[PDB]
DNA sequence: GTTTTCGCATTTATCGTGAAACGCTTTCGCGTTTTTCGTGCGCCGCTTCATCTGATGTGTTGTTGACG
DNA sequence: CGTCAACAACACA
DNA sequence: GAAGCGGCGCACGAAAAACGCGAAAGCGTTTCACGATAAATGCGAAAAC
């Protein structure tokens, strides 16, 4: 078997291979002289004469390589210690603690002393630690497991969210860190739409999508991706909105569902609000520094515009020359899209949590929050004329004073109905009664 | 009686054989050689300490209140 | 007095 | 303002592949003997001219 021999040739150093290379023409030339029947003496004297080599060495090596085939002649020319201590050390390093090697080793020395174990050299120990596995380190921290056709413009869009590090004073006066959801065209990388709000919830996604399909339309083959590899909650309209299934609406749009920090967060105008990744940051300065919602949102819109308009984008489509806007304007004109009807757009208007319907076929929504306070009562004959107890109300905040649309709890449209700080005081009082009691318990 | 051929003897030559000697190449044998491989320690440079740590959304269950 | 329905908390992803 | 852990480079020593000197055995071609046989030459005698 020439496998072990050739692996020995292979594993040899460059210097060793060079040595074999140097020794090969001398052995081969020698073979020629003997074939001619030249005296061994004259042949070796001649080779040792022309080539600087010991005649005896050449002779000996020739006989050694004689038994080997000629193509392989080159390849021819080329810790006992206590397992308990070793196990103890390995056991120690693999702990999530992951102590320093030299110190863990010293501890091991103490244990070895107590048990009388014969330990190997620190260098040997660590060497063997390297020899263990890439997987073992992960075994200690569970780390690696945490890592592990033609596309038209508008054909495939990706949705992503972003939590801002900038403090903004919102429309309701509260100072918060806004969260914005963005829709991006996968091919051209152009941002097609966005919506910003006080927290992460479906509304910003839904409405940014609405912005995207209203502005650019709905393609005939529509793919949407949100990599997850429901929001709702009370009551910005004083009535709760909403536990639903957005999923159905997306599938209905004819969409197949799949599962700037420099421009916004780092813009000069917000410098008092953005703190930066500062581990130590004084909280005493910031209540005054929080920027206005209008300024933040304007800076955001301009940041998006500048991100899209930025040339020198290194992508296939831009070829290091054009901007996302250029390639989007170019490719969008080569795709076939359809505009959404008024009805479709209205079906996307916001869902209110189920309200009770009386025997008379009327129900109530207590309007408030960002809208003018009022207790709206809606009515229709179809509500009293068939089976219903609870009903989901779909509405446009701007049209609450006139027409809403009632749906059954399972989603079937029934008919439309015509129209015939509050809880924050409790929230604040609760806050004070917390803080005072908390300080009193701390002391 | 003179010459020539014919029969017998001794000496030398050579073969066929068998065990044998030399000379060439081939190996292995052992003393002294040469490289590679581990074990081992010491030094240098980088980085943290001079003050550091936990959540959210939705569903289900339990308890309590209201209603029959 | 008994049962049912809703609200609130805790646990889970 | 201070110190430790990690990582890398240099040296020692020892074992395993090695090297140069040999040397003997394997082995081929050649060796010598030894001896025996023929055959080639030696001599003489008898027949021949």
From Swiss-Prot:
Protein name (Swiss-Prot/TrEMBL): DDE-recombinase A
Domain of life the protein comes from: Viruses
Region span, Target DNA capture and bending: 351-443
Protein family membership: Belongs to the mulikevirus repressor c protein family.
Region of interest called 1-gamma, viral genome ends binding, as start-end residue ranges on this chain: 79-148
Function text: Responsible for viral genome integration into the host chromosome. During integration of the incoming virus, DDE-recombinase A cleaves both viral DNA ends and the resulting 3'-OH perform a nucleophilic attack of the host DNA. The 5' flanking DNA attached to the ends of the viral genome (flaps) are resected by the DDE-recombinase A endonuclease activity, with the help of host chaperone ClpX. The gaps created in the host chromosome by the viral genome insertion are repaired by the host primary machinery for double-strand break repair.
Transmembrane regions: none
Subunit text: Homotetramer. Part of the transpososome complex composed of a DDE-recombinase A tetramer synapsing the ends of the viral genome and the enhancer element. Interacts with target DNA activator B; this interaction brings DDE-recombinase A to the transposition target site. Interacts with host ClpX; this interaction remodels the transpososome for replication and is required for the flaps endonuclease activity of DDE-recombinase A.
Residues of the full protein shown: 88 to 594 of 663
Keyword Cell membrane in record: no
Location of the region described as Catalytic in the Swiss-Prot/TrEMBL record: 149-350
Organism: Escherichia phage Mu (Bacteriophage Mu)
